[PDB]
Enzyme design. Structure first.
Site, PDB file in Angstrom:
ATOM      1  N   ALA B 299       0.845  -1.160   0.000  1.00  0.00           N
ATOM      2  CA  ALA B 299       0.000   0.000   0.000  1.00  0.00           C
ATOM      3  C   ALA B 299       0.901   1.236   0.000  1.00  0.00           C
ATOM      4  O   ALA B 299       0.607   2.209  -0.650  1.00  0.00           O
ATOM      5  CB  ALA B 299      -0.892   0.050   1.222  1.00  0.00           C
ATOM      6  N   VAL B 301       4.240   1.404  -1.030  1.00  0.00           N
ATOM      7  CA  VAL B 301       5.277   1.507  -2.025  1.00  0.00           C
ATOM      8  C   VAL B 301       4.632   1.506  -3.400  1.00  0.00           C
ATOM      9  O   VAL B 301       3.779   0.638  -3.667  1.00  0.00           O
ATOM     10  CB  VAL B 301       6.174   0.281  -2.069  1.00  0.00           C
ATOM     11  CG1 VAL B 301       7.182   0.389  -0.913  1.00  0.00           C
ATOM     12  CG2 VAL B 301       5.253  -0.961  -1.942  1.00  0.00           C
ATOM     13  N   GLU B 303       4.371   0.676  -6.917  1.00  0.00           N
ATOM     14  CA  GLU B 303       5.122  -0.263  -7.735  1.00  0.00           C
ATOM     15  C   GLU B 303       5.303   0.352  -9.104  1.00  0.00           C
ATOM     16  O   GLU B 303       6.260   0.075  -9.782  1.00  0.00           O
ATOM     17  CB  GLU B 303       4.384  -1.604  -7.868  1.00  0.00           C
ATOM     18  CG  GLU B 303       4.522  -2.531  -6.665  1.00  0.00           C
ATOM     19  CD  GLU B 303       3.630  -2.112  -5.535  1.00  0.00           C
ATOM     20  OE1 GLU B 303       2.516  -1.598  -5.783  1.00  0.00           O
ATOM     21  OE2 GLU B 303       4.031  -2.291  -4.341  1.00  0.00           O
ATOM     22  N   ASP B 345      35.254  25.957 -24.076  1.00  0.00           N
ATOM     23  CA  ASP B 345      36.432  25.973 -24.858  1.00  0.00           C
ATOM     24  C   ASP B 345      36.181  26.884 -26.009  1.00  0.00           C
ATOM     25  O   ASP B 345      35.066  27.064 -26.487  1.00  0.00           O
ATOM     26  CB  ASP B 345      36.743  24.547 -25.405  1.00  0.00           C
ATOM     27  CG  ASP B 345      37.828  24.607 -26.451  1.00  0.00           C
ATOM     28  OD1 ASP B 345      38.778  25.420 -26.362  1.00  0.00           O
ATOM     29  OD2 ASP B 345      37.723  23.791 -27.420  1.00  0.00           O
ATOM     30  N   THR B 347      38.030  27.321 -29.288  1.00  0.00           N
ATOM     31  CA  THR B 347      38.194  26.964 -30.688  1.00  0.00           C
ATOM     32  C   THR B 347      37.493  25.726 -31.042  1.00  0.00           C
ATOM     33  O   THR B 347      37.786  24.645 -30.579  1.00  0.00           O
ATOM     34  CB  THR B 347      39.642  26.855 -31.094  1.00  0.00           C
ATOM     35  OG1 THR B 347      40.322  28.051 -30.761  1.00  0.00           O
ATOM     36  CG2 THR B 347      39.741  26.540 -32.589  1.00  0.00           C
ATOM     37  N   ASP B 686      35.705  20.763 -27.666  1.00  0.00           N
ATOM     38  CA  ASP B 686      36.068  20.002 -28.849  1.00  0.00           C
ATOM     39  C   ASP B 686      37.350  19.223 -28.848  1.00  0.00           C
ATOM     40  O   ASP B 686      37.618  18.421 -29.730  1.00  0.00           O
ATOM     41  CB  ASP B 686      36.340  20.806 -30.102  1.00  0.00           C
ATOM     42  CG  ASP B 686      35.478  22.028 -30.233  1.00  0.00           C
ATOM     43  OD1 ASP B 686      34.322  21.928 -30.727  1.00  0.00           O
ATOM     44  OD2 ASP B 686      35.998  23.089 -29.823  1.00  0.00           O
ATOM     45  N   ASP B 690      40.522  19.409 -23.775  1.00  0.00           N
ATOM     46  CA  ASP B 690      39.362  19.512 -22.977  1.00  0.00           C
ATOM     47  C   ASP B 690      38.960  18.305 -22.192  1.00  0.00           C
ATOM     48  O   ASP B 690      38.146  18.325 -21.302  1.00  0.00           O
ATOM     49  CB  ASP B 690      38.219  20.391 -23.540  1.00  0.00           C
ATOM     50  CG  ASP B 690      37.730  19.934 -24.898  1.00  0.00           C
ATOM     51  OD1 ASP B 690      37.338  18.746 -24.971  1.00  0.00           O
ATOM     52  OD2 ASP B 690      37.751  20.754 -25.832  1.00  0.00           O
ATOM     53  N   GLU B 780      -2.249   0.294  -9.780  1.00  0.00           N
ATOM     54  CA  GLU B 780      -0.904   0.719  -9.912  1.00  0.00           C
ATOM     55  C   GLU B 780      -0.244   0.315 -11.192  1.00  0.00           C
ATOM     56  O   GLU B 780       0.513   1.090 -11.803  1.00  0.00           O
ATOM     57  CB  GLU B 780      -0.079   0.322  -8.672  1.00  0.00           C
ATOM     58  CG  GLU B 780      -0.298  -1.168  -8.321  1.00  0.00           C
ATOM     59  CD  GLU B 780       0.057  -1.288  -6.839  1.00  0.00           C
ATOM     60  OE1 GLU B 780       0.341  -0.248  -6.236  1.00  0.00           O
ATOM     61  OE2 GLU B 780       0.034  -2.465  -6.326  1.00  0.00           O
TER      62      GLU B 780
END
EC number: 7.2.2.19
Lengths: 175, 993
Positions: B299, B301, B303, B345, B347, B686, B690, B780
């Protein structure tokens, strides 16, 4: 968790559950108004009568004989209590489950209802309303027995309520 | 561990040649001895990187099974199974009940499991991206004679020789080099070749000419150099180790859920024990009190919950893919909705990573070309006579050519063979002039003096196309000061004019200025050769100045710049409106980085770094209050020196920051600095440089096309398109769902109470059980599912972009106000709705409610075929059971009717159904209809009586909960109204999700 402000919670629910226990009960007491005192809205559930027994697994009244159905009149309070008819090797007693306005219809093993009673008026209408042996050779053993009732009105549900219009018990008598 | 890797490297380029050997135990000329090369091999190890320690077995499937949530379902399944086992103590009904429930639970963990585990089975991979490039042999010198050896064999000390084309095998100290050039993009992100000479150019080892680094490839030339470092020890080797070996961690959504499971459990226990104790005081042994506590699980939890959140996450991800935004992880859908700062970044991320042209000075005016890819800008000048003459030299005095066979691709996009400056000129002319080839053809190149090192200038002699002259024309270009030295006249407009001292500085002005833009400048001039001196035939000498080099007509100047992606300046702005901080982090030089920063909106108008102010004030910097500068640009060479506390302050201190010339470890440092603050940081990049930062960031985003494999692996998300604007959409997909999810939680949870209460009342009241375990699972698993999911479709009640990021700590996904709402108020209305139908069915049957109390023992008593109802009749065991079962069915239905209301109310937190229009959501309406239709099916369909114990319902039965449904819709609607009116206080404080 507040400071101070629980009022504004505690007083809230007070007259909001209040309001809600008050509408709910509101809706019950309305429903309740729209039902007969003497007869349920649906009979369908009870539709075939079941058979039950005593075992565990008058006067005033009127004298009667074995006849047809006795109609008491309508199911109304304008008449007072409708009048009811009178009525080793254990003794099991079988009765037919009372159902208002229902007229039953009739007009090897191992070794081992009168119409004048109906229709049943129902409790409010009739309070002291009485509804209507294994002499067997074997002894000292379990015996499975099934007692059933007959009619065009009666039906059995072998898969479901084994009760419906029938019993199933295992007797033993150890002397 | 990882921390040392974050620090910058320290070296030996200052050391003399001889000194380096001395350290090494090596011979400059001869190289290490064979014997000595071996030793050192064992002493040190191989010249090989520690294979990517990344391998999470397919056993990882098992990770989706547990979580915290799946646990709750596991323990619950396990509690059911125990209960069953306790029910072993006698001949029990559970063959349908408890075993069925516990199996259902396990099965929802498993299924949910699988599902998750797939939507994720699509990603990962990083070490294998890195391995994608993985040495072979090296040529070394040992015992005076060179040989090629497996690269792992190389050790510190030996002599290595590399030529143009090869990959530097290890870190090396350059002892000898001729005309060698390298590519150091692995370090810097920048491709243009860098000289390598034996003498130490600078203090920084990353900067100096004398060192050549592993993971780098000699572009041309030839060199030799002593192995300073091998395997893990090399600069990049450290970077490698400093990557994959990263713990991915928990996402915010995942955290929010975990935090949900705790609260839920919190309740499911509290109540579940409470019902142990309340049952004790009633008349229940240790046998019975116990069976209730565990009983109290289902009741409690939901599901259906796990599944719903997932399909909700999956559903949203699909929308995004439609968006050209691919999401590797389901959890990734939400994170975007909580990014405070982005470290980008420059470039290839922010920018297209594609050189181009710049401005021009001629007509004694500075012109600005369109730099854009799409060339969105306008046309600076076609008119000028001077302009053509200048265009001529740019096209003619030019070697470059476009590669063959992309007439398909646009001019700025096509690859050209040649140096960058010469390509820039070709593209420029090809765009505004028409085909270059044309012009080449039409003015055939007689003779030319290629751009020398000494001359600093490149000229050509061409037959003029004008048929009436086809005389010779001289065109040259090179260092601006040099071209001027070489001129008598200036083509101003159509006509030449003496090059007075006045023009000499107006030129000198432009040159200075363009050169301040951080642009490279070239000077241009041409000469109409006297036809007397040069006959048609005339032979030119490129070897010795046959012809005149001085007193030429100075045409003009050509500069250049750099641009970003179209979408980017906007995308940046959007983010800032979003209240996100954007921070540039680039390997690049500071002049360029700052320029772009302005361009993109990282640095806003008016802002100023100390030095700018510096300069407008005319005042030295020490002099300048730091706090006056909102903006900051910090070189990596300065960032090295600084403490992490000093970093934190810079970060605290400036709204617009640019870190330039940063190393990969520094990018990582910045992020960590960011996070220390406790902000959620997106890194967008890129490059291989990085990697540590992308790998660090709460979410790493990588460019799909341009992006190096490394960045792609390291990232959570890939912009397949390289559409930066995507980032904005991604952030707008992390706020509408977070809210819509709470609605679906409140919706699902509310039905819990109508499910709980009947069992409790059953114990307290001693009435026949009103709802069954089976009946619950239909709600449920069946009925509540579509409606719950459907909530995801819901829209914004307000402009979502306008509000600040959620404080993860303070505003939880599931909060006490939800519970109170779901449980305390709405669920409670729901329960009575169900109870009413209960009473109506029994009452109608002949069992009035007053008689109901205390009955369960008789009712349950199998033996009594006899049970007498209020009327006085007698019902068998089965008969009254059928009625009860009908009740279970009606109660089930009552919830779906009340669930319609809940659905409606749940659609909005603040807004009135009327404002929102409950209507627009088509998916939701579909939930009401299919939901109902499922219920009707469960009731009506034959066989459903036996299989799920669902009985047919009269038409009347359908109505019972109606007044309840309607009260819910009214009660909520009222409340929200109230909440809109006084935002400040009470209703909002208590009830507002």
């Amino acid at each position: 968790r507040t400071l101070s402000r629980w009022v504004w919670i505690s007083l809230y629910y007070v007259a909001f559950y209040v309001v809600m226990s008050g509408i709910f009960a509101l809706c019950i007491y309305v429903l309740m108004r729209t039902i007969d005192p003497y007869t349920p809205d649906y009979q369908d559930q009870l539709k075939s009568p079941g058979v039950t027994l005593r075992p565990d697994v008058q006067e005033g009244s009127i004298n009667c004989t074995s006849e047809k159905y006795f109609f008491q009149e309508s199911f109304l309070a304008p008449n007072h209590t409708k009048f009811s008819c009178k009525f080793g090797k254990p003794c099991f007693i079988i009765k037919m489950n009372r159902i208002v306005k229902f007229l039953p219809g009739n007009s090897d093993g191992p070794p081992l209802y009168s119409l004048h009673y109906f229709p049943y008026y129902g409790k409010k209408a009739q309070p002291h309303y009485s509804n209507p042996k294994l002499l067997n050779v074997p002894r000292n053993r379990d015996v499975v027995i099934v007692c059933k009732i007959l009619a065009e009105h009666v039906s059995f549900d072998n898969p479901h309520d084994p009760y419906e219009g029938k019993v199933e018990f295992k007797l033993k008598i150890q002397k | 561990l990882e921390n040392m890797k974050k620090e910058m490297e320290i070296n030996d380029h200052q050391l003399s040649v001889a000194e380096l050997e001395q350290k090494y135990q090596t011979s400059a000329t001869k190289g290490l001895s064979a014997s000595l090369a071996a030793e050192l091999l064992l002493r040190d190890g191989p010249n090989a990187l520690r294979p990517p320690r990344g391998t999470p077995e397919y056993v990882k499937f098992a990770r989706q099974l547990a979580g915290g949530l799946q646990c709750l379902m596991w323990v619950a399944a396990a509690i059911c199974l125990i209960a069953f086992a306790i029910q072993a103590s006698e001949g029990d009904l559970t063959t349908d009940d408890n075993l069925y429930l516990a199996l259902a639970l396990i099965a929802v963990v498993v299924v949910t499991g699988c599902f998750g585990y797939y939507q994720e089975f699509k990603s990962t991979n990083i070490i294998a991206s890195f391995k994608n490039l993985v040495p072979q042999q090296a040529t070394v010198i040992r015992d005076g004679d060179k040989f090629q050896i497996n690269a792992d064999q190389l050790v510190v000390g030996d002599l290595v020789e590399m030529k143009g084309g090869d990959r530097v095998p290890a870190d090396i100290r350059i002892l000898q080099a001729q005309g060698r050039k390298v590519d150091n993009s692995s370090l810097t992100g920048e491709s243009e070749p860098q000289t390598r000479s034996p003498e130490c150019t600078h203090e920084s080892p990353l900067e100096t000419r004398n060192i050549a680094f592993f993971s780098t490839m000699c572009l041309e030339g030839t060199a030799q150099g002593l192995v300073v470092n091998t395997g893990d020890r090399t600069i990049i080797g450290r970077i490698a180790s400093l990557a994959s070996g990263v713990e991915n961690e928990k996402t915010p959504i995942a955290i929010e859920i975990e935090h949900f499971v705790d609260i839920i459990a919190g309740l499911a226990i509290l109540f579940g024990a409470t019902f142990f104790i309340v049952a004790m005081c009633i008349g229940y042994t240790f046998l019975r009190a116990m069976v209730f506590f565990m009983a109290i699980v289902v009741a409690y939890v939901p599901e259906g919950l796990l599944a719903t959140v997932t399909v909700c996450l999956s559903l949203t991800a699909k929308r995004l893919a439609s968006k050209n935004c691919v999401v590797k992880n389901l959890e990734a859908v939400e994170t975007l909705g909580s990014t405070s700062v982005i470290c980008s970044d420059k470039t290839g991320t922010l920018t297209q990573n594609r050189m181009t042209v710049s401005h021009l000075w001629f007509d004694n005016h500075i012109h600005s070309a369109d730099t854009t890819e799409d060339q969105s800008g306008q046309t600076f000048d076609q008119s000028s006579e001077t302009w053509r003459a200048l265009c001529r030299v740019l096209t003619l005095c030019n070697r470059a050519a476009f590669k063959s066979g992309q007439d398909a691709v646009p001019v700025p996009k096509r690859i050209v063979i040649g140096d960058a400056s010469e390509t820039a000129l070709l593209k420029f002319s090809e765009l505004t002039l028409g085909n270059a080839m044309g012009y080449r053809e039409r003015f055939p190149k007689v003779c030319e003096i290629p751009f020398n090192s000494t001359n600093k200038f490149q000229l050509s002699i061409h037959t003029l196309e004008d048929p009436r002259d086809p005389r010779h024309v001289l065109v040259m270009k090179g260092a601006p000061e040099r071209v001027l030295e070489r001129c008598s006249s200036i083509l101003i407009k159509g006509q030449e004019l003496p090059l007075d001292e006045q023009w000499r500085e107006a030129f000198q002005t432009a040159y200075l200025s363009l050169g301040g833009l951080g642009e490279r400048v070239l000077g241009f001039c041409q000469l109409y050769l006297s036809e007397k001196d040069y006959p048609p035939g005339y032979a030119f000498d490129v070897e010795a100045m046959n012809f005149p080099t001085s007193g030429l007509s100075f045409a003009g100047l050509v500069s250049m710049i750099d641009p970003p992606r179209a979408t980017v300046p906007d995308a940046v702005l959007k983010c800032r409106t979003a209240g996100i901080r954007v921070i540039m982090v680039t390997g690049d030089h500071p002049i360029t980085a700052k320029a772009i920063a302005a361009s993109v909106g990282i640095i806003s108008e008016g802002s100023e770094t100390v030095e700018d102010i510096a300069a407008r004030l005319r005042v030295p910097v020490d002099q300048v209050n730091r706090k006056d500068a909102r903006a900051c640009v910090i070189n990596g060479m300065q960032l090295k020196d600084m403490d992490p506390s000093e970093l934190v302050e810079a970060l605290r201190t400036h709204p617009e920051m640019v870190f330039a010339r940063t190393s990969p470890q520094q990018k990582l440092v910045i992020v960590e600095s960011c996070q220390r603050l406790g902000a959620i940081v997106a890194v967008t990049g890129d490059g291989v440089n990085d990697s540590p930062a992308l790998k660090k960031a709460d979410i790493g985003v990588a460019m799909g096309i341009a992006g190096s494999d490394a960045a792609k692996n390291a990232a959570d998300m890939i912009l397949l398109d390289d559409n930066f604007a995507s980032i904005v959409t991604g952030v707008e997909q992390g706020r509408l769902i977070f809210d819509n999810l709470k609605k679906s939680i409140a919706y699902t949870l509310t039905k819990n109470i109508p499910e709980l209460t009947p069992y409790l009342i059953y114990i307290t009241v001693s009435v026949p059980l009103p709802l069954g375990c089976i009946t619950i699972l239909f709600i449920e698993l069946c009925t509540d599912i579509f409606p719950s999911v459907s909530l995801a479709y819901e829209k914004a009640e307000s402009d979502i972009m306008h509000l600040r990021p959620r404080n993860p700590k303070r505003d939880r996904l599931v909060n006490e106000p939800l519970a109170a709402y779901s449980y305390f108020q709405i669920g409670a209305i729901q329960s009575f709705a169900g109870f009413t139908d209960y009473f109506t069915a029994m009452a109608q049957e002949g069992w009035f409610p007053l008689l109901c109390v205390g009955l369960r023992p008789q009712w349950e008593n199998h033996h009594l075929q006899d049970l007498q109802d209020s009327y006085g009749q007698e019902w068998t065991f089965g008969q009254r059971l059928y009625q009860q079962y009908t009740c279970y069915t009606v109660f089930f239905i009552s919830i779906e009717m009340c669930q319609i209301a809940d659905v409606l109310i749940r659609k909005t937190r603040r807004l009135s159904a009327f404002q929102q229009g409950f209507f627009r959501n088509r998916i939701l309406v579909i939930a009401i209809v299919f939901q109902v239709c499922i219920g009707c099916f469960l009731c009506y369909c034959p066989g459903m009586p036996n299989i799920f114990n669902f009985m047919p319902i009269r038409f009347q039965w359908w109505l019972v909960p109606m007044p309840f449904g309607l009260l819910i819709f009214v009660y909520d609607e009222i409340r929200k109204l109230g909440v809109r009116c006084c935002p400040g206080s009470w209703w909002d404080q208590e009830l507002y999700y």
